[PDB]
Amino acid sequence: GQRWELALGRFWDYLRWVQTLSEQVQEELLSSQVTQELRALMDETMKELKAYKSELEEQLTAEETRARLSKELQAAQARLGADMEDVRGRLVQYRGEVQAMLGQSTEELRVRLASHLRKLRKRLLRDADDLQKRLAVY
Amino acid sequence: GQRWELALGRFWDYLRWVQTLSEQVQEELLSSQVTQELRALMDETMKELKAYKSELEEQLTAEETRARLSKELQAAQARLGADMEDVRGRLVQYRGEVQAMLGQSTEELRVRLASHLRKLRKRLLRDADDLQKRLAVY
Amino acid sequence: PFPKPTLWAEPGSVISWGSPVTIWCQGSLEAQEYRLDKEGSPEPLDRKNKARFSIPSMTEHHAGRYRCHYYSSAGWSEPSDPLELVMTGFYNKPTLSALPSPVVASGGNMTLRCGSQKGYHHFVLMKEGEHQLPRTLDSQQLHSGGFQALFPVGPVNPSHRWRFTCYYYYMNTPQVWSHPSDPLEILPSGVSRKPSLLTLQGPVLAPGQSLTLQCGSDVGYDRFVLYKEGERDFLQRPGQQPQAGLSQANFTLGPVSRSHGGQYRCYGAHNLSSEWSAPSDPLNILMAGQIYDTVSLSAQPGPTVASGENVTLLCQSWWQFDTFLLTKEGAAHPPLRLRSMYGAHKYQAEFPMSPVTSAHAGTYRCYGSYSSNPHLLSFPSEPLELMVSG
Amino acid sequence: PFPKPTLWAEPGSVISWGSPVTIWCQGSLEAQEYRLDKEGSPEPLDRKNKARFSIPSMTEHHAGRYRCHYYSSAGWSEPSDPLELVMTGFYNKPTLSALPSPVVASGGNMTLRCGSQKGYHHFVLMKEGEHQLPRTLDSQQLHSGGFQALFPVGPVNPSHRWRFTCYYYYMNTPQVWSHPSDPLEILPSGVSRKPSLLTLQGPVLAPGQSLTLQCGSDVGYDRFVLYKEGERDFLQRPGQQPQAGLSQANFTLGPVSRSHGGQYRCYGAHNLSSEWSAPSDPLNILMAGQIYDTVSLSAQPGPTVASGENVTLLCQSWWQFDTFLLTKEGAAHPPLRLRSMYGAHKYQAEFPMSPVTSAHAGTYRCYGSYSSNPHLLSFPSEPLELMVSG
């Protein structure tokens, strides 16, 4: 799973960069650059994940048990996808809030953003772990 | 005691400024300016304290009890003097350490300085309180 | 086909946890038997043209979509339109705020942000007084995490009051909502003549003083609102008429603290006037004693001078105060605020008073503040009594 | 007058808590009775020319100044010179360090800082091996608070070893000291030929690798010292001779961690040579995997190229890494370290490789570090295999 895991790693590190919320991040968060970069990084992760699933499916050598396992794998993939989408939507909402605030970003707003980002990062981690374990049992 | 207390207040605030150890303070700490300013502020405090003692002594209206009280007052004054002297000596020692370090001030050195300054500030506070109480009972 | 039955619930669709609710179904005049089904539950709820189904206590088990259909002598009718009975007394309440301020220009647009601490919630904005469909984020759904929802409210016409309340719900149970959020009233400011806000307790306030901001108008408004920029809500007092035409209202803010230091604008309206007047001039309330860092005031040439010389009061500090203010004992005008300038190890501000006159004499004190909160000032400097001589 | 008696204590004046000590007094040949008094205590301690006074266990009550005097057939003698019996096994131990480094130039001056966590202590520096008076801060006393004491040590001549130990004492009890601090050896570096420090495990080390720094000299030194700039102590290994003249010593540092990343210089001396050779060339040990921030390596024009083109490897990162390093798999030379340059949202460093030759081919990885600790690097970038074609 090295490839999909490596893409996931890149996503995660860019997310930590955003988590710092330094002045560079703050200015990029109002110009869509960050959100689009995250979208690129998550598309790669999902493509690679599907590729790895397909190649593992060739290596496989009952039917109901296999069907159940494939269903579980699909469910885990979807969860990871949803989590990254959530992160990106929370970042678009922050842009909108700062705009509705007439371009003003309060410290309170940013504290809330950080809190929510940490909560979305934990979910992502758990789901990623589960997906890895499912790929292992597959 | 308003006058001596006001001088004490100035000393205390300059000491808090130094406690921050920001880049301005750091550069002034290697040029003697800070130490001399503190010396000026403590000389004023001591002069004013003695003046207040003298004027209170006029208002006073047994002998052994009075002698004991005067002795206690003198002891408290000396303590405050010693505490401020200690602060200033600790600041001169920091200059010397940075010089023996060939002009290099490590974060560790500064952390230690801050720790010691907070310990000298507590003593100063306690002694000041005691002196105020003694002036009250006098 | 017979006329399809109709379905309605009184007092309403949204019923709190425990509150009683009865659903009604209307069919044909010769109807024989009414049957109320529930999406998900085959069992009919409870039981000639009017048939009721009563629920003694609304519980999470009765919260769902219901459909009705009556039996006729010729067969069964079409199922009814669904009715979503909602139980809205469960989850903790969320927080509704306005962006950028509760006061909006008439005909203008704004955004109301609803939010909760936990995630996985779908928010609904309910405008009090309007019988509209619950406004869910799902129309503009976004993958964010369920923590917040931004609802754009607009054009804010001033023909009625705009009061809002917010609820949230988990997707698994779409008809079980949370506790209603605290309501938010939106004020439509217009172009009518502005009132006047006058403090009655001096320029710089020290902790403990009873601040009373008096708002007044000559146009004859009947109700006044005071808003501190940055807050979620406002204060409202009616406008008494000491004189015919003159309408005034005293907003007793009481003892002062950190919270009382800010910019206040007053708006005036009438009992029948939903819209509000243009804002009054801001009244910046400055709070002294909120910074333990100290400032010092010196006069150059000296505290003693002769009329016609050049006196320059200097307010200095070793701390990096962003601005330095100057107050004169007795003067009611706001303090002279000037920016700091790093000089000889001390940041300072020179308040030039040349040539000096007989009026310049008095007690002067200087303060210092940071741009983080420009209303939280320091403790006053030691007074300086400038003495001019003819 | 009779010859004034003499006073001495064996094994010494400084005696640990509990250790036994006997004080001796020497008077006249016809002396009748010896009396040992103590400053403060009228009672004589314990009891023809030699008289002893034994103390089974040194306790805080025997720590003080003692004076002796013997009775003669003609009267009493002059009191003796005082002897300060000290108990040095009580207070916790302080910390002795050297400023700027344990290694000093021969004939040079330095400062040794002694210090404790609590205040109100007077420090004493004792040079091991020299029978000198305890060196107290009181000679250069300063009102500081009793937390530290700076002792200037110098000229450090290389005729002997300079080893130091520090104690402290409260003013109320001047003869009751603390526990001896950990000793500190000062190395007098000179002008003799330098040795050579060679790592045996690659330029950039990953956690878990067994670092072994080999020091070697052709002049034939017999003992080697390895010092990591910034440390209080050094490591010493003797120099074996694999070949006649060549002397080498392997400093097995073992598994690597954050602590092993720094600049190392090696010094060589002889069993009889107290002085040490000039330092060796520094060996900066770089530790990978100490920063979770990531870097990326790209080649422009491309991973595939032809001999004679212009390849510029680009190491970029969204983080503000101060410098970017480049390693080639197989190469033993230290990594190419270049500073960062903010470009299109990503800080970067271009490693130009024009014109490219057959030698430029290989696996390349880039790292990134901060100037806070220039030896703690990040995890390696994904390898880039440059392929050149004739």
From Swiss-Prot, chains A, B:
**Ranges of the sequence repeats in the UniProt entry:** 40-61, 62-81, 82-103, 104-125
Cellular location(s):
Secreted; Secreted, Extracellular space; Secreted, Extracellular space, Extracellular matrix; Extracellular vesicle
Region annotated LDL and other lipoprotein receptors binding sits at 116-126
Q: Tell me what happens on changing residue 118 to C.
A: In HLPP3; ApoE3**
- Give the sites modified to Methionine sulfoxide: 101
Q: What is the effect of changing residue 6 to P?
A: Found in a patient with hypercholesterolemia; uncertain significance; ApoE4 Freiburg
Q: Which family does it belong to?
A: Belongs to the apolipoprotein A1/A4/E family.
The disease tied to this protein in UniProt is:
Hyperlipoproteinemia 3: A disorder characterized by the accumulation of intermediate-density lipoprotein particles (IDL or broad-beta-lipoprotein) rich in cholesterol. Clinical features include xanthomas, yellowish lipid deposits in the palmar crease, or less specific on tendons and on elbows. The disorder rarely manifests before the third decade in men. In women, it is usually expressed only after the menopause.
Q: How does it assemble?
A: Homotetramer. May interact with ABCA1; functionally associated with ABCA1 in the biogenesis of HDLs. May interact with APP/A4 amyloid-beta peptide; the interaction is extremely stable in vitro but its physiological significance is unclear. May interact with MAPT. May interact with MAP2. In the cerebrospinal fluid, interacts with secreted SORL1. Interacts with PMEL; this allows the loading of PMEL luminal fragment on ILVs to induce fibril nucleation. (Microbial infection) Interacts with hepatitis C virus (HCV) envelope glycoprotein E2; this interaction is required for HCV infectivity and production.
Name of the protein in question:
Apolipoprotein E
- The UniProt gene name for this protein comes to APOE
**Range covered out of full length:** 41 to 180 of 317
Swiss-Prot record, chains C, D:
Tell me the keywords, alphabetical order.
Answer: Adaptive immunity, Disulfide bond, Glycoprotein, Immunity, Immunoglobulin domain, Membrane, Receptor, Repeat, Signal, Transmembrane, Transmembrane helix
Give the record's glycosylation annotations as residue positions: 109, 271, 310
- Molecular functions (GO terms): inhibitory MHC class I receptor activity
Q: Which cysteines are joined by disulfide bonds?
A: 25-68, 114-166, 215-266, 315-366
Q: Which domain of life is it from?
A: Eukaryota
Q: Where is the composition biased (Basic and acidic residues)?
A: 35-46
Biological process (GO) annotations held by this record are: adaptive immune response; cytokine-mediated signaling pathway; immune response-regulating signaling pathway
Q: What is the recorded membrane topology of this protein?
A: Single-pass type I membrane protein
The residue spans the entry assigns to the Extracellular side of the membrane are as follows 1-390
Compartment annotation: Membrane
Primary site of residence: membrane
- Cellular component aspect of the GO annotation: plasma membrane
Ig-like C2-type domain: which residues? 195-284, 293-378
| Function in brief | May act as receptor for class I MHC antigens.
- Supply any other comment: Belongs to the leukocyte receptor cluster (LRC) present on 19q13.4.
Q: What is this protein called?
A: Leukocyte immunoglobulin-like receptor subfamily A member 6
